[PDB]
């Protein structure tokens, strides 16, 4: 019931083409609203609300804080990348591919391709009947984060009675299950 | 474009609770627990490749505490406005009869990062066997959290995820059954 007050620093590194281009943000949030940020592509601190002004003004006046901030892109981001790269950037987990029929209230009325426990997120799930791709007549849950470094999705085809084809970085050739 | 690592922290008053975590593309690498003063890797196997000294993050949070109290006063004590969470419950994988699984309570799109959570089986609170993540960040700067309950699927049990938050007038009671 008491009033609450919240303070989020966010220190982000954005990696492009591997490590060839890096963008570092130092971002500060009072309650929900951002107030002040350092942006590697800008080169100094900027206020984004009037609250963050004295912070931005004062940090800008310090040669060493500014020198440190400008270094982060190399001395922190590129550092950290090389440390975690092995088990994050190069992480690869095979999906498990189930197909079962389902209902939505009637045999019954749609087929479900279930693809679970994969990493990374990027995936291509597609339906086939007799070699032909069924482009229209299918719905999805989208991509779902499980929170444990695996994704899952359900791609459903609505036709009353088939091949599910799953392409993914983890496998050298697409996974099929037939029904 | 392709990869993003964020050092994400907060401090909250008057609860006096802070967090510190690293995030990779929306997944926790690790966090440090203030209470136990130890660094916890999201996957056991991470810790074999990298180190982080917890006492660094503890030092960072002290400053965060200090700084929050400046901004509260600077703002003439304007409180955060509660955004109520959005709860949904799904299974780790396709549900087979009496084949081991995990229920996931997915708590999304909320602020501030305080949440009371209870699993119920058949209306009876489940204390032991539970597991949870810390508060994960979002690009819109709300929070996100996962609760987990491993289980044997059966006709016998119904399950619920009871979530309390200050934005909610009513405790949110999300149902799952076989």
């Amino acid at each position: 019931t008491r009033p609450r007050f919240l303070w989020q620093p966010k220190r982000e590194c954005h990696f492009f083409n591997g490590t060839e281009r890096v963008r570092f943000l130092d971002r500060y949030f009072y309650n929900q609203e951002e107030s002040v940020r350092f942006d590697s592509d800008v080169g100094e601190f900027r206020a984004v609300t009037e609250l963050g002004r004295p912070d931005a003004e004062y940090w800008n006046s310090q040669k060493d804080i500014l020198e440190q901030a400008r270094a982060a892109v190399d001395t922190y981001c590129r550092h950290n990348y090389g440390v975690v790269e092995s088990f994050t950037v190069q992480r690869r987990v095979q999906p498990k591919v189930t197909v079962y029929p389902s209902k939505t209230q009637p045999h019954h009325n749609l087929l479900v391709c279930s693809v679970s426990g994969f990493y990374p997120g990027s995936i291509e799930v597609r339906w086939f009947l007799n070699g032909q791709e069924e482009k229209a007549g299918m719905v999805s849950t989208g991509l779902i984060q499980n929170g444990d470094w695996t994704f899952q999705t359900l791609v459903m085809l609505e036709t009353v009675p088939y091949t599910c084809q799953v392409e993914h970085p983890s496998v050298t050739s697409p996974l099929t299950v037939e029904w | 474009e392709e990869h993003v690592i964020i050092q994400a922290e907060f401090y909250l008053n008057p609860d006096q609770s802070g967090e510190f975590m690293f995030d990779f593309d929306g997944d926790e690498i690790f966090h440090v627990d203030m209470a136990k003063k130890e660094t916890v890797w999201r996957l056991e196997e991470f810790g074999r490749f990298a180190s982080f000294e917890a006492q660094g993050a503890l030092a960072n949070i002290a400053v965060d505490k200090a700084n929050l109290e400046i901004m509260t006063k600077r703002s003439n004590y304007t409180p955060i406005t509660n955004v109520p969470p959005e709860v949904t419950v799904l299974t780790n994988s396709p549900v087979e009869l009496r084949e081991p699984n995990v229920l996931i309570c997915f708590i999304d799109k909320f602020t501030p990062p305080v949440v009371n959570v209870t699993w119920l089986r058949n209306g009876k609170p489940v204390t032991t066997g539970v597991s949870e993540t810390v508060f994960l960040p979002r690009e819109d700067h709300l929070f996100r959290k996962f609760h987990y309950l491993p289980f044997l699927p059966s006709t016998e049990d119904v399950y619920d995820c009871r979530v309390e938050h200050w934005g909610l007038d009513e405790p949110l009671l999300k149902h799952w059954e076989f």
Partner: T-cell receptor
Amino acid sequence: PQALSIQEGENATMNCSYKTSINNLQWYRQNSGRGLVHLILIRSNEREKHSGRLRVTLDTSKKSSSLLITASRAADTASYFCATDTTSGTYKYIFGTGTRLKVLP
Amino acid sequence: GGGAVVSQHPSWVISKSGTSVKIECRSLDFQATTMFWYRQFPKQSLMLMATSNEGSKATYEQGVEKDKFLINHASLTLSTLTVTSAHPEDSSFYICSARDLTSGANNEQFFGPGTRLTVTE
């Protein structure tokens, strides 16, 4: 280890190579027995840095730094070392091979 | 905080060959999770020898006689290098440094005055 460099009141330029990719590089001077005075630090993104009579080059291409001390006093006589932490590694600083400097009046 | 000095004691040592020698490295203004022991002989440069860490293990650089010394770091302010046996060949300059744990990315460390040990038969 230890290269020797001798002069008068002129400019002194001293070189210091290192074995790994880097984050921070710090220059030190040492007298005899004890000593260890921190002089300056240049970071793996910066090329040039000026402080007092001292000036530091860094060329991460050739993994090499240069220390230029400009109006050399007698009391500049010392060993000059530079120490570096390796990027994506531990906290450790490792010491490069050094130069002994003698400034004669 | 906002500052850092480290103290190394004792400054000079004379021990008989066969006796243990104990050196203390203290951070006074700041806190160290991790400290570093360097050895140096008359002409040559500073060899890093061990890293000490609060709980527990000592690492030891390659290399480097591993456990002809013991390192104890269980203080967050104090790391102890004890040379177990000590012979004339160990007569050296020893010097410790400590990383401020507040520094993070800009990896800030500070050196003690040193210890000037000589062992005689």
